[PDB]
C-alpha cells in the first residue's frame, strides 16, 4: 500500500523540505531588520567605544591611568576609510565610499579566513598598480607621482591608472576590487566576488562607471551560476526584500539590458543610470546592503563534494564550473565596452590582463587559504582568562575579608 513511485515522491518531499528549511533559516536574519544591513556603521558609532576589559589593560588603567579602548569592526573600517590605497587621493568620493564599504565588509565578515591572493599571480607581475605611461614598470611602481599627467593631445593622453586588490577566503576563490582612473574624468569601480568550484553560490558583481564626477552607469548583481539562469530562493527573497527596503521609489523597470547582460543577469539584477543624488544614495545603500547580505549568507555555506556514492553532486559541480566559465566568457566578450578603456595599455597586455586576472577560470587551480579561526580563541581567553589556583586562593582571602569587613 505504498508503491515505488510514492516512495520516490516521499523522498522528494523530504529532500526539498530540507531545502526550504535552509532557505528560510538563511533569510530570517535579514527578514526583521533589513536596514541593519546598511545602518550597521551608524549603529556601531552609536554604540561607541568599548572599554577593553582585559587584565593587562585593567592593570594599565590602575597604574598609569591610561584607558585602552576598542571599536567594532564597522567603525574600524570607517576609521580606515579607503585605507593605504596608492590612488586614494585622485578617486571620486562616491568610489572611495563604495571601496571603503565593500573592503570593510570583506575584512569584517570574512575575518580569520581572508587571505591575500598569491603575489606570484597578480603582484609579482606588477598588476597591483599599473600606469599607462609606464607599462614596463621602469619606475618601480612610483609612476603615479613620478610622472606628471599628459598634456592634451600629447602622446599618452588620456592617462589610465588601475589599482587592484585581490583577496581569497574559505568560500571565495577571488574577491577582486579594481579602480581605474582616466584624465577625461572617467572613473571605474569593478568589484567581483567569486565562489569556489565547490559551492552552489552566485558570483557577486558591481560596476560603477562615472564621467567627470557624474555617475553614468551603476550595476549591482548576484549573477547566477546554474544552467537555468535562476538563483536560489534565499537569494531571490533577499534581493527582492532589499530592493523594496532601499530602492523605495523610482521607476520600476530601470533595466536597459544592453544585449550582453542577458546571459548572466539575475531576474532581480540592478543596472541603472543614476539621475539624482537621491537615486545615487539609494543605489549605494542597496548595493552595500546586498553585499553585506551576500557575505553574511557566505558564512553558513557548505561545499559540495562528489565522487563515490552519488553523481548528482558531480553534475552540480559541473554546472557550477560551466556557470563560472559562462560568466567569465561573457565578461571577456565585453570588448565592445569597458575594454575600450584599455588598448591604451596595449592590446596584447590587455589580453594578458583580462585572461589572467579578474575573469579567470581553471579546473586545476584553486587558490590556497589560511583559515586561522583560533584568534577568536586567543581574544576570548584574553577577555576571560583563568588565573590559577594561587590566584583563586588569594581571591578567596579577599572575598572573606570583604565579607567580614563590609
Amino acid at each position: 500500500p505504498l508503491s515505488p513511485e510514492d516512495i520516490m515522491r516521499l523522498v522528494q518531499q523530504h529532500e526539498d523540505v530540507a531545502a526550504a528549511a535552509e532557505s528560510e533559516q538563511l533569510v530570517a536574519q535579514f527578514r526583521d531588520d533589513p536596514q541593519g544591513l546598511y545602518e550597521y556603521v551608524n549603529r556601531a558609532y552609536a554604540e561607541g567605544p568599548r572599554r577593553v576589559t582585559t587584565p593587562i589593560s585593567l592593570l594599565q588603567e590602575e597604574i598609569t591611568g591610561a584607558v585602552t579602548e576598542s571599536y567594532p569592526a564597522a567603525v574600524a573600517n570607517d576609521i580606515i576609510g579607503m585605507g593605504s590605497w596608492r590612488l586614494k587621493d585622485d578617486v571620486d568620493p562616491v568610489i572611495e565610499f563604495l571601496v571603503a564599504r565593500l573592503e570593510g565588509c570583506w575584512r569584517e565578515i570574512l575575518d580569520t579566513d581572508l587571505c591575500l591572493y598569491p603575489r606570484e599571480k597578480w603582484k609579482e607581475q606588477g598588476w597591483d598598480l599599473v600606469d599607462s605611461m609606464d607599462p614596463h614598470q621602469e619606475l618601480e611602481g612610483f609612476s603615479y607621482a613620478d610622472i606628471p599627467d599628459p598634456a592634451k593631445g600629447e602622446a599618452g593622453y588620456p592617462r589610465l591608472q588601475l589599482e587592484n586588490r585581490v583577496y581569497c577566503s574559505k568560500v571565495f576563490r577571488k574577491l577582486h576590487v579594481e579602480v581605474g582612473l582616466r584624465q577625461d574624468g572617467l572613473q571605474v569601480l569593478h568589484v567581483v566576488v567569486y565562489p569556489r568550484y565547490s559551492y552552489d553560490m552566485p558570483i557577486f558583481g558591481m560596476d560603477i562607471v562615472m564621467v567627470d564626477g557624474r555617475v553614468t552607469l551603476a550595476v549591482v548583481d548576484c549573477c547566477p551560476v546554474r544552467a537555468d539562469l535562476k538563483l536560489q530562493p534565499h537569494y531571490m527573497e533577499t534581493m527582492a526584500l532589499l530592493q523594496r527596503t532601499f530602492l523605495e521609489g523610482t521607476d520600476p523597470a530601470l533595466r536597459r539590458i544592453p544585449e550582453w547582460g542577458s546571459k548572466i543577469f539575475s531576474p532581480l539584477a540592478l543596472c541603472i543610470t543614476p539621475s539624482g543624488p537621491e537615486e545615487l544614495a539609494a543605489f549605494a545603500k542597496y548595493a552595500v546592503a546586498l553585499h553585506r547580505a551576500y557575505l553574511t549568507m557566505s558564512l553558513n555555506a557548505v561545499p559540495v563534494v562528489a565522487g563515490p556514492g552519488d553523481r548528482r553532486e558531480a553534475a552540480r559541480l559541473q554546472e557550477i564550473q560551466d556557470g563560472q566559465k559562462r560568466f567569465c566568457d561573457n565578461q571577456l566578450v565585453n570588448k565592445k565596452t569597458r575594454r575600450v578603456l584599455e588598448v591604451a595599455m596595449g592590446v596584447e597586455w590587455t589580453e594578458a590582463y583580462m585572461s589572467q586576472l579578474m575573469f579567470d577560470f581553471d579546473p586545476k587551480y584553486e587558490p590556497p587559504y589560511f583559515d586561522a579561526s583560533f584568534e577568536k580563541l586567543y581574544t576570548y581567553f584574553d577577555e576571560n582568562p583563568s588565573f590559577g589556583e594561587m590566584a583563586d586562593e588569594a581571591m578567596e582571602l579577599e572575598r572573606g575579608a570583604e565579607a567580614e569587613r563590609a
Partner: peptide, 26 residues
C-alpha cells in the same frame, strides 16, 4: 626599524588639498 611607523603614517594619510581646493596651471 626606527622610521617604519612614520612611513606607514605617510602612506595611510589623506591628502586634503584635492578635497579643499575647488575650481594657468589648472
Amino acid at each position: 626599524l626606527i622610521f617604519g611607523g612614520k612611513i606607514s603614517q605617510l602612506l595611510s594619510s589623506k591628502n586634503l588639498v584635492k578635497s579643499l581646493k575647488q575650481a594657468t596651471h589648472l
